[PDB]
Amino acid sequence: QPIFLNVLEAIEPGVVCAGHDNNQPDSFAALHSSLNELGERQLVHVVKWAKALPGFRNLHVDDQMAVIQYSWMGLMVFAMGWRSFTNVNSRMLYFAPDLVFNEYRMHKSRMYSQCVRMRHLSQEFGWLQITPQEFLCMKALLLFSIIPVDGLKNQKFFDELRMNYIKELDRIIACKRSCSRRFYQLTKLLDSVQPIARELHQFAFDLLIKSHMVSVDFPEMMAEIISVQVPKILSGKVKPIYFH
Numbered sequence: 292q293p294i295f296l297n298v299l300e301a302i303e304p305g306v307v308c309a310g311h312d313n314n315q316p317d318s319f320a321a322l323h324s325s326l327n328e329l330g331e332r333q334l335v336h337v338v339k340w341a342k343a344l345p346g347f348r349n350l351h352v353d354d355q356m357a358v359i360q361y362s363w364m365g366l367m368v369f370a371m372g373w374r375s376f377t378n379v380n381s382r383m384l385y386f387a388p389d390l391v392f393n394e395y396r397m398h399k400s401r402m403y404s405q406c407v408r409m410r411h412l413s414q415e416f417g418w419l420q421i422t423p424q425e426f427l428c429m430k431a432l433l434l435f436s437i438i439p440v441d442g443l444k445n446q447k448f449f450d451e452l453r454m455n456y457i458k459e460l461d462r463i464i465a466c467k468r469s470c471s472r473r474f475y476q477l478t479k480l481l482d483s484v485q486p487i488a489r490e491l492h493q494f495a496f497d498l499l500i501k502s503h504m505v506s507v508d509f510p511e512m513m514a515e516i517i518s519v520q521v522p523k524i525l526s527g528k529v530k531p532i533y534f535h
């Protein structure tokens with residue numbers, strides 16, 4: 292009955308700070324430096340969260356790491372939109388308690404238009420009156436929404452898992468106070484995460500290439516993920532799974 296949701300609610304990670312020094316002038320290098328540090332700290336929590344999801348450890352251990360490394364951008368963007376919605380009504384981007392983007396930061400970060408798309412995504416939680424239970428189920432399904440075109444180590448295991456998480460989603464909708472219309476809406480929202488994720492992937496890749504010239508620092512796990520895993524997505528070897 293409520294077992295699936297009990298689990299999702301119990302493993303939801305808590306607040307992560309970026310460690311940003313807000314006394315610092317808002318500059319390109321300092322902002323993306325803080326975001327990267329934020330990314331590394333969140334990644335640590337995403338790994339632990341994913342390993343505790345129902346059935347995840349049924350995946351080959353090789354596949355476990357890969358789906359986390361391919362889907363983390365979308366997961367983090369989606370969670371960030373939810374944070375922004377529930378904390379500042381999506382009026383600004385709430386990356387962390389200590390790293391809230393206003394319009395000035397959007398511009399200095401040189402990714403203003405991507406931020407606007409992130410704010411639009413954020414605004415959807417509000418437009419659709421997304422429930423915390425729908426949020427949690429949708430976020431779990433994002434973990435299973437991007438894979439190699441030539442499939443994973445144990446692809447059949449991934450397919451049943453993904454199948455069951457879509458089922459849990461229909462269930463959370465069907466257990467609400469037109470399910471058909473809701474499901475269509477939440478799948479469109481989920482799909483909308485991917486193009487955004489793809490823009491940020493491109494942006495981080497370009498930044499990492501010119502890192503040593505724009506004075507932006509990359510913590511270890513990120514320099515690795517962005518030079519080993521992200522190019523596979525930008526080169527089309529790894530592609531999102533779209534509903535529509």
Ligand SMILES: C[C@]12CCC(=O)C=C1CC[C@H]1[C@@H]3CC[C@](O)(C(=O)CO)[C@@]3(C)C[C@H](O)[C@@]12F
Nearest residue numbers: 323326327329330367368371386491494495498
């Ligand atoms: C997932 C993070 C961090 C954690 C978070 O709540 C939201 C996002 C989405 C935007 C990402 C940034 C967009 C460009 C970026 O700043 C860089 O590419 C730095 O070079 C990124 C990729 C750093 C970091 O990873 C992100 F902030």
